[PDB]
Write a protein that binds this ligand. Structure first.
Ligand SMILES: [Zn+2]
Ligand SMILES: [Zn+2]
Length: 95
DNA sequence: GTTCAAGGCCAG
DNA sequence: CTGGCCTTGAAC
């Protein structure tokens, strides 16, 4: 399937839904360090595989827009296991 | 024992 | 900063 954010190849469920590996890394990086970006355009830049790197601000807005969850990023940076969205993913897979 | 989604590593 | 690959571990 295609990443709902940039269209790249999905690698699995990441923070609420299927996304590509790069967007998973980007969202993690962003939320973990409270990164704050600023768009030089009009905060409505188009995101695609070849432009996602051009504006992190709009890339992040899209991540939130499509449904990526801030709560899936762990405050205590705990490793492994499975979060509260475990069952949800199991349901999304079936349907 | 196996899954597999979340965190970590690091070459570029 | 980016993103492909690695490590971790509760849930099943
Ligand atoms: Zn993506
Ligand atoms: Zn923008």
């Amino acid at each position: 399937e295609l990443c709902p954010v940039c269209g790249d190849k999905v690698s699995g469920y990441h923070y609420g839904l299927l996304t590509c590996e790069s967007c998973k890394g980007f969202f993690k990086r962003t939320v973990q360090n409270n990164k704050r970006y600023t768009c030089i355009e009009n905060q409505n830049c188009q995101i695609d595989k070849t432009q996602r790197k051009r504006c992190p601000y709009c890339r992040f807005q899209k991540c939130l827009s499509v449904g990526m969850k801030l709560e899936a990023v762990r405050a205590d940076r705990m490793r492994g296991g499975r979060n509260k969205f475990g069952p949800m993913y199991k349901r999304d897979r079936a349907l």
